[PDB]
Design a binder for this molecule. Structure first.
Ligand SMILES: COc1ccc(OC)c(Cc2nc3nc(F)nc(N)c3[nH]2)c1
Length: 208
């Protein structure tokens, strides 16, 4: 069964700003999500220092970038800490409320969209290039979940019956029709080199 939830009003507002504002420098979505992955990998790494059993669900700490032209998706995969149901439905939204407001304020004073990550809400930059985002995630303390949103003010959560992922998070970007450049190998490489060059975890760009 699929539960449908309303975004907090501020988040829905931010999402619509991201979708509606004319802003050509869309490529920053990728460093935002890679950075989110890196924080999540840092978290499970730190936690395992005092409980090595936390790595029973997978020892490898890394990031995969997987384009698929047939499906028109770009997937960012990590083996970080993963998200619980509570994170998905409640906690992320609660923390995002302040960041969103600060960001929206900054945006006059003349900040720009590329600065979204300094407000801890970089995830929503996915909406610069994706019409729909699906997030598959698994935390040690919980079951595997599928979060999904095409914006418009709501998101869904369901327990995921797909392939089990061990531990971590996959963000599946269903790209907008005019955003398929982000499926191209050389465009992805270029972006990773420019914005994510010093991430402390292996980043593997899959080819097709
Ligand atoms: C639905 O997913 C999100 C919604 C809002 C949001 O930041 C407001 C984030 C940001 C984020 N949180 C994450 N937690 C883990 F363990 N791994 C990741 N790769 C994560 N990315 C995710």
């Amino acid at each position: 069964e699929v539960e449908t939830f309303a975004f907090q009003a501020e988040i829905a507002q931010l999402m619509s700003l991201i979708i509606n504002t004319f802003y050509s420098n869309k490529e920053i979505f990728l460093r935002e999500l890679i950075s989110n992955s890196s924080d999540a990998l840092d978290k499970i790494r730190y936690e395992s220092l005092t409980d090595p059993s936390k790595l029973d669900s997978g020892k490898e700490l890394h990031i995969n970038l997987i384009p698929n032209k047939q499906d028109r998706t770009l997937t960012i995969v990590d083996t970080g800490i993963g998200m619980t149901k509570a994170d998905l439905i409640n906690n992320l939204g609660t923390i995002a409320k302040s960041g969103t407001k600060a960001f929206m304020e900054a945006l006059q004073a003349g900040a720009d969209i590329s600065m979204i990550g300094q407000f801890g809400v970089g995830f929503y930059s996915a909406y610069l290039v994706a019409e729909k985002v699906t997030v598959i995630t698994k935390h040690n303390d919980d079951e595997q979940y599928a979060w999904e949103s095409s914006a418009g003010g709501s998101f869904t959560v369901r327990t995921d019956t797909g392939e089990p992922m061990g531990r971590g998070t996959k963000v599946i970007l269903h790209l907008k029709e005019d955003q398929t450049e982000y499926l191209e190998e050389r465009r992805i490489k270029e972006i990773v080199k420019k914005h994510s060059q010093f991430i402390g975890y292996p980043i593997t760009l899959f080819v097709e």
